[PDB]
């Protein structure tokens with residue numbers, strides 16, 4: 001997260017770190033046995049790490065659970081990143097408490113102007129690599145579709161939305177992919193892509209979760 005602030009330990013109880021010997025993507029806990037992340041974060045050997053704050057120190061509250069299966073959306077396109085969503089089933093259920101809690105799926109999509117919270121352990125520099133130990137947060141608004149399409153002509157599908165600041169300075173960045181964009185307590189987006197990080201007129205692009213709720217529900221119900 002570039003230009004964000006330190007969240008504070010366990011203040012984002014639904015945030016998870018996907019780990020394969022190092023942190024490579026974020027994700028969101030939506031119930032005790034399932035996590036939602038981005039399809040492009042897929043790989044085998046994923047260990048989901050819940051209740052984390054400093055990802056390099058065991059401070060207590062952590063639960064390390066292996067993924068039993070990862071389900072990439074069948075229509076995911078790696079060239080356009082359209083349908084960049086994945087569901088991860090955990091080998092065993094997580095113990096939910098105040099430090100580990102799930103987030104709710106939305107009932108309706110959000111409107112431009114809605115302020116959301118984006119979090120993650122990704123890079124904090126736009127020009128260079130500085131990876132934090134603790135979780136970073138950024139409050140950012142959803143932009144209108146015209147500003148988004150005007151920023152990325154021909155690359156935005158109906159399953160994406162832009163959130164951020166056109167002046168540059170604040171944005172999600174590498175290491176944050178797969179993580180949550182929560183607005184009014186509902187998971188509205190998943191960190192997907194962007195051009196550089198925090199550059200002027202190049203906002204972050206997110207997967208529009210409101211468009212996949214029946215898919216998530218049906219998929220979970222059958223697995």
Ligand SMILES: NC(=[NH2+])c1ccc2[nH]c(-c3cccc(-c4ccccc4)c3[O-])nc2c1
Nearest residue numbers: 040041172173174177192193194196197204
């Ligand atoms: N500017 C942004 N809002 C942004 C957000 C998420 C990103 N994630 C990345 C990213 C960059 C290189 C590699 C990966 C990657 C690729 C495969 C697996 C895991 C991560 C990224 O997510 N850049 C990103 C840029």
Ligand SMILES: [Ca+2]
Nearest residue numbers: 054055057058
């Ligand atoms: Ca830790």
Ligand SMILES: [Cl-]
Nearest residue numbers: 149153154155
């Ligand atoms: Cl267009």
